[PDB]
Structures are given as structure tokens and as C-alpha cells.
Amino acid sequence: GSSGSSGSNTPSAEADWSPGLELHPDYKTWGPEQVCSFLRRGGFEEPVLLKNIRENEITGALLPCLDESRFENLGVSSLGERKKLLSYIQRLVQIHVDTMKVI
Q1: Modified residue Phosphothreonine is at which positions?
Q2: Fold classified for 31-92
């Protein structure tokens, strides 16, 4: 077999910590805080979107509860955005509190 590969660029930071490690397993207690970060992981970085999260105390337990119309009121007034967000939150509940667990 073929083995061997040289070539590496210079790093930027060398520490034992990162701005993104993981989140709490109990999304039910994510509150308006974690939720404001969860969306950021999907690609959504809108201020109005994360703003409503604190204005409505939106929590992880409510994430899967909100629907298209809801998101449209939370600031996600976009046919494409919602279409993505809706499917996004789905990837959460489908994993969290699921009979099957995986790292």
C-alpha cells in the first residue's frame, strides 16, 4: 500500500480550548441562550432571529414546536430560510432524547 505525505502550513493558535466544543444533551433546558447559538451552528446569523429568541424566551424544547409561520414572525421572513430552519431543528430532536445515541 501507499503511505507517506509531507507538507503542513503554519498554525494560528495552539491551546487546549475552542470557541465551539459541544452543547448540553438536554435541549429541553437550552433556554434562549443555547438556542441563540444552535442556529449559529446551522448558518443562521441574523440579529432579529436570535433577538426573538430572548423576546419569547424561546428554548430548545420550543425549537421543534415552532413552525413555518412562527419562524416567519421570529424574523425568519424568508421562504428559503424557514425551509432550512425547519429542517435544521429537525436534525436536533431526531438525535437528542433518541433511543439511539452516538458521539
Answers
A1: 10
A2: DNA polymerase; domain 1 (1.10.150)
